[model samples]
Target chain A: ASGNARIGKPAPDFKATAVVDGAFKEVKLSDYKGKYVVLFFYPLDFTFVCPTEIIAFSNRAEDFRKLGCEVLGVSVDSQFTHLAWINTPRKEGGLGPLNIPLLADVTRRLSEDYGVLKTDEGIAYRGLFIIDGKGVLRQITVNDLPVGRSVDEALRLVQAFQYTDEHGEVCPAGWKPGSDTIKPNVDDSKEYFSKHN
Target chain B: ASGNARIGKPAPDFKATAVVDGAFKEVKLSDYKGKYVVLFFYPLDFTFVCPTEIIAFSNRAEDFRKLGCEVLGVSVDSQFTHLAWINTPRKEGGLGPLNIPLLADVTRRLSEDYGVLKTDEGIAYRGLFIIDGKGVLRQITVNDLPVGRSVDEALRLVQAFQYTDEHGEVCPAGWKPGSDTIKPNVDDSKEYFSKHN
Candidate 1:
């Protein structure tokens, strides 16, 4: 379960029709190819534990896009179900004017391919994956159905991954982009391991 | 292989042995069946990158145990290697007197079973798994071979899990237990969320 997969490899190109707002729109995984893609999974559209996570990510879509990452949300629910929820106002229950695109994973292929679906239960848990421009999955975080995930943590992970990529070094404990990173050399690591509090 | 492992149901019972100082001692998952368990993976023994993670967990072991959880550290190294490292002074390269029992996955079975083994290669990455009382994994966090995980975050998660269990209430954003917990009720969420900071 922890083995590496298409991580360094190119994501399989994909296209599908998912409802957006009142109309059905054609969407493709390749549409996100030249840019970083922030893809995530949830158990279902309307549930006790899923909306807070959905809206939390939706609220931060602009922030992600600003970093050149397109945020795509997917679940096992139908397009109609997702639209109905999105159509419902935030005050009532709908997600309402979310800045990101919500994909209807009704066929379950995307969920299966991305490794988030639980076919026996016919739902996905909270799985968030970040794929960089080269189509490699740079980060993946998954939690059980009842647990809610932190968007800040997700944002920080992307920044850390990007920082390591840009700097060509490894991050230390509790590392953030501008703080500090150590070169993967023996002496450099010696400094990281010994520096006192 | 991003596809999930066909959702193998968690074992109702599981066990492992750890080289706790001078002897091999067996521990069962059911022993902590009503409590939480914090299990972590490091890269290797006597390596440049594993100590920071091991010591962080050791330093916070009391906190986890106080919260009714146990901490177990593992790597795919020999038990003799584990003892040698435990004997080595922290000032030097060894993880001396780390206090927590270090499991030798010499055959690498635990790492493989836990899905942290980098099989083709011969090392385990940073894989941290939290199993709840019933032995089902509640949360799992994995990192590449380069980074060290935070002990603070791990402690907080245990508290969150235990807090929610005791109260039947949902933990809110950045929840720290005593601060406040919503009743998992739809109407109760806004008290914390709607307030203007």
Candidate 2:
């Protein structure tokens, strides 16, 4: 059961203890008010599928930084669980020291607010969300427990929005940098459609 | 409003009108159940960002096909809108001819059921979902209104899961073909982490 996080509305904020570089740190959604945020949730830590996605996201930390976005992950597991999993080598079912912070939703309030918790199962589904600098919930997604996600796609999603915000133009389908964009008007679109069609 | 199609469970199926090679056709999710499917949704047709994402996916139709996966796009736009957009080229506002089917979720039920619909706006956010050959829902991601998704990332996602399905081994961080995978145990993982770490 998914909850409502409207695209145009402000992102729901939460405060929780998170494991950052193997240390416990307080994390608040409002803390990164002026930066784009890529927030995701996995079912649990120390599972088969979660590390592949988490470590991949950590590896792409630089890419997200280039676009002024911060990548954070959440799960219903405890801080100790998060720490042990982070310290555990990639091969040993523990994610190594991740560049991004892993928020611990131990009580599941954050997951519940995000509508990612599988209440019956008492864990989050694989949910990923994109929030804008203004704290608006821009995007949200959830996969089943067994599926792993892609970090490169998350990077690309942030880039697309960043470009749009800075350029005052909208990206077209399959839009990549230096390709083409529209001016958000009928006539402006015709200039593109008329020639290409 | 999202549905409960868990990742390890059967993907929710639907039938809708779709535009294929410039013609209107009835399409069903189950028709591609025997094949892996990349079913994604965009906000609308004839807009700024929809075309780039659509065409990019269209350009990669062959690659996805090679991987035994079919790519289909959906939006609240009518089939006619889908056709016009596909008939339109990249230079103009239209999408030109597309290689994959563009499904019309005209009533918004499909988008709603898929948990991508922005009810107040009556448009789907950029949501991408991956389904396996067994009809199980695997991965899902969404972007803000302005964000466009990555076809390359989508391609890689399919590959990562495909590898796991065929080999029964879990992929590690930054896993690609030819990269090492784990045998799903702490000891098995040590072999990989010990060496890499």
Candidate 3:
């Protein structure tokens, strides 16, 4: 299960029962083959840091969708537990309604495949993977249990990847959609340096 | 080499020659045992995206130092190449000066030890690791060649890790220094949810 995923290679595919739009449905990674995918794993349901991260992504669902990407949240919780957490009110420390699907890795198969599962705790670290439209794994980030990640950073990476794939250019640090890009060569890239420097 | 570094475990130690303040010096991972370390790797020197990233971190050296953290950049290039790049002017598409040490991994030992070396190309990916004050690897991020990472995000993560280690509370998404943090338990965390929700 470990080391199955690598950068520039096809992402590990998974099929699971996910709580999407208040219903339990079977979803597959390959189903979104033509769209970028943001697959993120949190520790558990009804937790402290997990909900805030989930809700942050949920709030920015449209932004990812506009970039031709789908976001999926996963945890070791069962589908029923995921649904309960979704159904519970936000004020009561639950994810009231999510724009993205919550995949339940109760068996921990998906977590194992992604190498994010904490074996002793039966939970997952905060791991996020960005898969390209071709299903190639493009980026990976893993944070420890006590730290949550940034949704803005995730969105920026997706944009950077799409820009590079479309323009055949490499992005510089803190690159945004409309920012300047570097040609992927030593010779032709001087134009950018001359202007910026 | 692939799985030598894991979260919650001591980061793989290494000793190598690094270019520090225009001098070649031997540095070891154990040398910074009490201070956090931000070890990042790029593909090569005298490139486009790499210089921007190296300089971005260099420009913010004091910010990391203020947090009691040391930033180190690494690549598969030799120390001589790194020095040449440092000597070259920015207008000529080179890193004019750098505030951090550029660890030369010409042997590729550090790259391989970090599991970031692209065996075929003999270069490392854009991998960044955040090790805690205790020398445990806490955060990891790896991006493909075409895209660059956010230095702001890296700084924020260091702050988050320090905050959590000091306060024993978990940081939520996009958490800043003064932002609210959630207790790491379900029952006691409701106080944060009540106000935020």
Candidate 4:
């Protein structure tokens, strides 16, 4: 709660038990050090909207890894239930065969520390945080229970962030890394703005 | 906050004013009745990441409208400021000659009612809500300030929702409309789950 809770600040430290490949393990925020960290939170397990998101991110874990990033999925579900859901097949009410680890924050410490806890509902919202290689939070996105997420857009944001960090320039609207980045000087942007539209 | 507060509920209606073209007009949730409504809220008037989303939606306004959806843009700024944003050329600081209507939610009532309000900062997150013809909430997506939204995916959701409703079938993961919405029954989904993955 102290310091700047804004983007570009150091991410809040968190540690929790998680279900990984049917086994329980304690995961920490620093586990993914040296690679971009995508820390995403969902409301709960065994819900309609939640699986669509969980699997979507799971499906894209390879894409993230290929970009030198790591993905971690978190929820308020206990480690046992997380394992149960993982063991359950996609056809029979289980998440089945996801490509990444799912952290279980049963005590809600990590959720509260992440500023995503909804005590009244006994779950966290759909909260997502992207931390750069230096452990700085580059972006934060959260939504209520009913809303779904776009993993592709998050990938784009990470790409843009990596691109800007290396180029010392800002990514303009709809900017992909290979595309031209803004020069941070007004007069220098004309070529981009003029040809883009 | 009563009753399901979930689905089949009317949207929390409010009014906003923005330049529709070169002229000003007042727009409301009720105005889009008998048509689909794509109501989106962004944080600020001018910023780095906002325009990408705003223009992406605007460029697809015709496609949205052609599908019987009326697109409306909202921000917390005043009408005069909205007009100024319209007047300012896109190459410089203005949004420049957009086809869709931009709504001024200066009172913040619309933001709070829609649950997109960040009272701490007095700015709205990037929230998009799709309201059906009968004023029922169909879909919603909200992102933090730094992210841009997907226009094509929103369009795809619209088609999927409509298709599922008409055909009485469910959409699978990454299922677009007109692409065989498999029924929720076991026999039908068996083939779908096999071929898709």
Candidate 5:
């Protein structure tokens, strides 16, 4: 737990600059309304385990588009740092032409809003959020600086949220789109379990 | 317009009767916490287009599970009506053994809360919602009775929600997992964006 508010809460919106195609542009949380959003915070730029997650998500940018969603990377690094890292090329310890925009949270306010900013460390934890088209937060997950998160799982959560919105039901443990889900009602939901069991 | 609340809002919770494996059980919204939920309202159990949407979601009940999400089919019909339809084979003009539970919204209370209940028709229009693990409403889309909803789109929405929740980024138009996402304030943003543009 990064110690933030509950789900069903409005994700605090903010305006900031971002790196796109080796250039800079302003990005805002409000800009992504009416669409799914994935906002994440990493410890810093040009670090280990960070690039792996960044590049992996970057390479699959088209796939995310297919899901009608967007992705963003964040850290306390400056835009110059991000631009340099992007300019450095993958082989030269740089991210190089990432498919998605990487945010520079130099003020760390966005990171703090997301509860990823570590005041003591003056960096951030690996925090992630799935925000809905209405800018309400759906889910949140966090990791220490060492462990890299799974892009696949992230995609799945987005799917889960979208699925529920369209269907008005819920997913159970280890649920996939094609998998059996709980009809809710907890105790009363017996046959669905017994049949599957 | 589906005429429902905005995304990121708390989906109104409720309890009702659902037909499960030829049995009746009480179902509640809170029962499906910490997981994804897909709740949909149809016109009736034995009507045209209704069964198509119902069975379509039922057939992919397991697919929905791929994202830890469950499917629930709701209508104004009573549980008895639901059971009768379940007993009837699809070829014989019955729903057959749907893979998912069909909710009985006889009171129309649930439908009223969801805004899908049509007072004029004494039935519900096609309305769907994506509820996250924390019970926050994510997405809502409504359709006319003559039209049927798409299970594929429903599943894709689920994937999008899961993807964002896990990754902490935002998906763009048609975004899917492994795709590029936007990170707000990407350019050296720790107070970073205004630099690169």
Candidate 6:
């Protein structure tokens, strides 16, 4: 099925088997409704770029959890493949232990639902989606097969969104926690530009 | 019109009036056919987040030009509005002088074609598209109104794409220039994983 996912809309919901903390579990997209979700899709497991990308997210899992967010890594690989890859030692091309869940989209249904399936390669491109606690899709990024994405940028976006949610102000370019934000209205925004510009 | 710009497909072509070097000129997407293009869109001119984002790209115009890429900014505001924004000083909540061309999408056609238009607001989200010399869309990113994007991340992506284009090897996660790349095949990729893992 073709994916119907779009920004500002509810993210497509899915239920799939995932390898979580070295065990298999049924993971659903709606299960983490009250928290932000960073759902990313890689092309495959046990591949060149995939492991580095997966491990990067895994390493930062605590940071995301502290922000009331959940990170999920997805691909067309089966759960068994995920387990095998996880079981392998990192020194020998393996993922070792991971902090996030690896959702298996072997049926390609979840990939299709997210519009990330690379039809020709039977895999996925580097696709990342940031969904809000309310389940609205707030950000979407997709890179070609050969390129990887920035984990810091993902975390920055999550922080930016959360800051906006709490403060009701808009972030400027390269904004982080302490950076100044602008009020979303014309007259009110002058306070920021006057000081910064 | 709705956007049909999909990843790996030819980018949707556009022709519009843009403010270039304090003047108005006709710009076409197909005109930059032989070089990489970073086409970005913001909501309106003289806005809070929009100015910082536009100025960030302007500050790094040389870096992009050195990389053989052209940067173009767009908004739903008219060319006249763009010129006005360009003429205004930075301290006054204005854009000041800009190094990049500001494409005027008063018709909202280009925003629609790029799928960044926020239907409810009659404006656009923070959308960035990276198109290759071959006219194929390589990367896409969209952020909601309250969030801003990373200009360095944008530059990194351009560099990553160019490196992959020239090297013919896939980039691992967080890959940068001088960073080791992996071979695109399973057997060949073992060389990277073995050494790094």
For model 4, how does the per-residue alpha-carbon lDDT over A1-197 read when each residue is reduced to its tens digit?
11123354578888888877778888887887788988888887765556667788888998999889889999988888888888767765458888888998888877777766666787876677788888887666554444455687778878877777777666655666576665655576655556666
Instruction: Give the RMSD in angstroms, all C-alphas superposed, for model 3.
Output: 1.3
Candidate that beats the other on lDDT, 2 or 3, i.e. the better one: 3
Q: Judging by TM-score against the true structure, name the best candidate.
A: 3
Cα error, candidate 5, residue A104 (Å): 1.0
The TM-score obtained by model 4 is: 0.75
> Model 5, stretches more than 4 Å misplaced?
A1-5, A186-191, B1-197
User: Could you give the DockQ of candidate 4?
Assistant: 0.15
Candidate DockQ values, in order, are 0.35, 0.43, 0.72, 0.15, 0.03, 0.64
Cα lDDT of model 2 by residue, B1-197, tens digit: 25655456677778999998888899998788679999999987878767768878988999999999999999998998787767665676667778999999988788877877777788888878889999988777677666667787778778888888887777654466687776766566566666655
Error of 3 at B24 (Å): 0.2
Q: What lDDT score is found at residue B196 in candidate 1?
A: 18
lDDT tens per residue, model 6, B1-197: 01577788899999999999999999998899889999999998878899999999999999999999999999999999999988988888899889999999988999988988888899988999999999999999989888988999999999999999998998888888899998888788788887887
Distance from true location, Cα of B100 in model 2, Å: 1.5
Pick by lDDT: which candidate is best?
A: 3
Give per-residue lDDT, candidate 4, residue A77.
89
- Per model, how much of the real contact set is kept? 0.20, 0.56, 0.82, 0.08, 0.00, 0.78
lDDT of each: 0.69, 0.78, 0.91, 0.71, 0.70, 0.89
Q: Provide the TM-score of the second chain in candidate 4.
A: 0.90
Ranking by DockQ: 3, 6, 2, 1, 4, 5
Between prediction 2 and prediction 3, which has the larger DockQ?
3
Lowest lDDT 10-mer window, candidate 6 chain B? B1-10
Off by over 4 Å in 2: A47-67, A85-98, A118-121, A141-147, A173-179, A190-197
lDDT of 3 by residue, B1-197 (tens): 13577888899998889999998999899989999999999998888899999999999989999989999999989899999999999988989878999999988899888888877899999999999989999999999999998999999999999999999999999898899999877788889988999
Write the residue-wise lDDT of candidate 2 on A1-197 in tens digits.
24656566887788999998779999997889899999888887887667778888888887888878999999999999899888776655668888999999988888888877776789887788888899988766666553466675566667778888898777665566676666777776666655544
Identify the superior model by lDDT, candidate 3 or candidate 6. 3
Interface RMSD for model 2 amounts to 3.3
Q: What are the candidates' C-alpha RMSDs?
A: 3.5, 3.0, 1.3, 5.0, 12.9, 1.8
